[PDB]
Amino acid sequence: LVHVASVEKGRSYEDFQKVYNAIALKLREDDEYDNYIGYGPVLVRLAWHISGTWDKHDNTGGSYGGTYRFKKEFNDPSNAGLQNGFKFLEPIHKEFPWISSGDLFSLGGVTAVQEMQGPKIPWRCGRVDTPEDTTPDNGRLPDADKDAGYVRTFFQRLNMNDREVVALMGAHALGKTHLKNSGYEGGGANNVFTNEFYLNLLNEDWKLEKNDANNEQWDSKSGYMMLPTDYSLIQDPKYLSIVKEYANDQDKFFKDFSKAFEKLLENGITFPKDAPSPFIFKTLEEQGL
Numbered sequence: 001l002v003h004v005a006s007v008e009k010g011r012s013y014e015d016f017q018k019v020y021n022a023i024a025l026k027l028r029e030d031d032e033y034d035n036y037i038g039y040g041p042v043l044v045r046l047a048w049h050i051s052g053t054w055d056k057h058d059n060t061g062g063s064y065g066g067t068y069r070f071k072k073e074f075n076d077p078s079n080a081g082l083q084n085g086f087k088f089l090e091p092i093h094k095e096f097p098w099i100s101s102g103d104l105f106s107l108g109g110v111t112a113v114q115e116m117q118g119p120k121i122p123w124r125c126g127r128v129d130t131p132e133d134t135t136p137d138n139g140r141l142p143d144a145d146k147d148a149g150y151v152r153t154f155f156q157r158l159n160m161n162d163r164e165v166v167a168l169m170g171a172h173a174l175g176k177t178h179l180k181n182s183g184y185e186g187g188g189a190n191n192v193f194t195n196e197f198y199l200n201l202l203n204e205d206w207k208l209e210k211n212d213a214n215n216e217q218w219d220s221k222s223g224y225m226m227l228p229t230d231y232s233l234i235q236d237p238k239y240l241s242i243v244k245e246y247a248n249d250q251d252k253f254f255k256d257f258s259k260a261f262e263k264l265l266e267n268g269i270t271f272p273k274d275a276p277s278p279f280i281f282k283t284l285e286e287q288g289l
């Protein structure tokens with residue numbers, strides 16, 4: 001099964017920078033969302049969930065087809081809460097109806113990371129909407145109540161190795177869990193992209209507690225939390241080494257996250273030899289906007 005990137009007709013870097021800017025401007029404007037966290041973290045989560053359905057074995061799922069717009073995927077229990085991100089992007093799509101859904105969802109994640117002072121994430125256009133019957137079934141996104149072996153095996157389906165997994169999980173520095181969405185509660189409620197996930201893992205005093213949904217999670221007296229799958233990154237000795245590396249090198253984390261996140265968002269897509277090079281968008285701050 002082959003998905004060939006097809007550039008939206010006649011569009012170039014400047015068109016996509018305009019879409020980026022519209023997303024970024026709305027991120028700045030709609031600041032009250034989720035007790036003043038803003039929409040950044042949920043947009044990152046959305047970009048990950050639309051990509052994380054991919055299966056390397058048959059090239060089903062993935063960001064290309066924009067299938068999150070269809071009920072089956074929209075209503076995946078694993079996607080509870082992401083409707084907020086979709087609603088945020090609706091007026092963007094209305095203004096720029098020419099962008100494909102997969103391009104919009106993935107660009108939303110890139111824009112959020114960058115606007116939250118994260119690394120630059122190169123981004124490529126050309127995802128093409130595919131029909132409702134191409135929507136992957138529910139159950140391809142990961143469970144949070146599992147151990148390191150589960151995480152490692154799960155991510156093999158996405159063609160991610162240990163370093164890539166540990167780098168991607170650093171996104172859990174952003175936002176928070178919500179009991180009604182996932183059965184977990186708490187989080188740093190941060191909207192600035194840093195390597196603090198790793199510092200928190202290594203430096204906090206963690207206690208295994210049950211939350212009000214009767215699920216186990218690790219809590220610190222400082223008020224942070226970790227999912228069992230997060231905590232597994234310090235229980236497994238291979239993951240632990242990488243956690244220590246990223247806790248001790250902000251730049252290395254940024255560079256590795258950028259590569260892994262672009263890869264995640266591009267899995268399943270064949271880029272023609274003459275496709276445009278990846279775009280690196282300027283932030284609003286860099287543009288003086």
Ligand code: HEM
Binds near residue numbers: 144171176177227
């Ligand atoms: C084993 C892998 C993973 C598991 C089990 C997992 C699980 C979860 C859960 C349960 C939540 C809370 C949802 C809610 O209650 O609203 C969450 C939130 C979040 N996840 Fe993950 N996740 C994983 C990997 C990732 C990856 C790879 C990324 C991105 C690179 C990511 C980005 C986020 C973000 C940004 C949030 C916060 C969303 C918000 O504040 O609304 N996650 N994750």
Ligand SMILES: Nc1ncc(C2CC2)[nH]1
Binds near residue numbers: 174227
């Ligand atoms: N450390 C940590 N694990 C999960 C979270 C929240 C969902 C963002 N924070």
